[PDB]
Design a protein around this ligand. Structure first.
Ligand code: MG
Ligand code: MG
Lengths: 295, 295
């Protein structure tokens, strides 16, 4: 009913398409039979996070078998692992806008070639919080830039193309519901600032280059807060932009590992951090299980 | 004589510094004894490229031993591997501006803590050529943006900071000399366009999103060419910017794998591609061996 769509007329005019970073191709792979049942896609930085994710969701669905399962489906690029169980796909996207951007182009084409429809896609991860306790889950309403605007700027053949970065409103409400229902941890909705850079792009004071003070950083974070920002990470903006353009229902669910208004490093004990790390996974696998119990 | 420098007053005011992505710290590691002899640093995308690099350079220097050597020095982040042989360091930086940017912040601090001076740093890699035969080596004069300008734009606490992206002129001349001396492959000097994005950022026609034609892409590439651009990759701009700011003598040496003025995919046979892949390594290890025979 909402099919995945490409916005590229050149594709229809091709002999074959190779998804270079997955080593999948239209000449060799039957996409509809492989991926046509896919309804939920979860994405995150590392293969180990996405592998823990698929094992959690498989157990929840009763699809967990005694053998050596959830094999990586794809190849050629270590940054990208892909796992599948029933209607769920779990894909790592690596670090930074360029790395997730390549993955999303090829993922969206995969899902298009598979004739997927009504696809929900959710990014999970960690983030620095602004004015929240360590361990709070943020469901992103808009993924904003360094001026706190809901816009992603892409340069296309030397020209600025501005795309909006709203997450899917209904999906946001559904995730918030799941969380209020679970009542296992503080969850808020807020905006998420997506930076390109970690040391200077986030107002950290420990870079090789820094032209500002603690006091300068605090003023900037206080302004981000007043503009609706609750957390900071590095992949959400391009994620949001491309997913709505191509007809995917997108959300971002990040846990905070610290409050940047109190300084730049993580105080929580190892055992505490490790329970925070599982929070986005907990919410999203619970949400998927709920959705597949009402289907 | 040219010491590595930090441009960060906050550092002097710290108890300890942790290089998070290398798992190295000032409280545990004696940086001057570990890295103070470092004069040459080669950087590239993948651990396997940088591991092939260090083994090539070690053999050239007579430092290659019969045992299981060039162990990865660092840990905690798969994207970053670090190898050392004599005064040479080889470091992988992963894919895209954000990933190399984190590595460079921590590398520059490492070299500063080690009290390194007269450090030459060189990025090796592959690229798409503009108006060059497949397999041509480009020594980058300036790493330019999507409008072909020698500038890198960084957002710092919401503000535009523009930094210049010239490579070190003298290093460029020295590398060109080594290449004319070797006479093993076509080498040019030219500008290198650094894009953030691969599918749309480079005018490719096979993205999930594409608002332009073959004819549009060609006009853009022809304009890049007329502005001095000879190749396209994804890490050189921030590399150039940060290295001159911090007192490193920087160069970029990329081989071209195709001519984008003839289309978007790589025609060369596997055996040919594999010999191209070694060209940047060949030039740079030869250059280092030359430098260490005149010391
Ligand atoms: Mg891309
Ligand atoms: Mg950085």
């Amino acid at each position: 009913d909402c099919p995945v769509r490409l916005l590229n007329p050149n594709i229809a005019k091709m002999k074959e398409d190779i998804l270079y970073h997955f080593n999948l191709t239209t000449s060799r792979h039957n996409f509809p039979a492989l991926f046509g049942d896919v309804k939920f896609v979860c994405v995150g930085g590392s293969p180990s996070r996405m592998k823990a994710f698929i094992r959690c969701v498989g157990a929840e669905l009763g699809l967990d078998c005694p053998g050596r399962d959830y094999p990586n489906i794809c190849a050629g690029t270590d940054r990208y692992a892909m796992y599948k169980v029933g209607p769920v796909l779990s894909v790592s996207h690596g670090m930074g806008i360029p790395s997730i951007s390549i993955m999303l182009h090829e993922l969206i084409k995969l899902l298009y070639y598979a004739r997927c429809s009504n696809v929900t896609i959710i990014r999970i991860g960690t983030s620095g919080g602004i004015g929240l306790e360590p361990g709070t889950v943020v469901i992103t309403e808009q993924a904003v830039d360094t001026c706190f605007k809901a816009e992603f700027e892409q340069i296309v053949l030397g020209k600025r193309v501005i795309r909006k970065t709203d997450l899917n409103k209904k999906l946001v409400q559904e995730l918030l519901l799941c969380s209020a229902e679970l009542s296992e941890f503080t969850t808020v909705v807020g905006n998420t600032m997506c930076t390109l850079d970690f040391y200077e792009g986030q107002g950290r004071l420990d870079g090789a280059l820094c032209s500002y003070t603690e006091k300068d950083k605090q003023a900037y974070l206080e302004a981000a807060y007043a503009a609706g920002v609750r957390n900071i990470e590095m992949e959400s903006s391009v994620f949001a932009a491309m997913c709505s353009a191509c007809g995917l229902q997108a959300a971002v669910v990040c846990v905070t590992l610290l409050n940047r208004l109190e300084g730049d490093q993580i105080s929580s004990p190892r055992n505490v951090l490790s329970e925070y790390q599982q929070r986005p996974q907990r919410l999203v696998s619970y949400f998927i299980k709920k959705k597949l119990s009402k289907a």
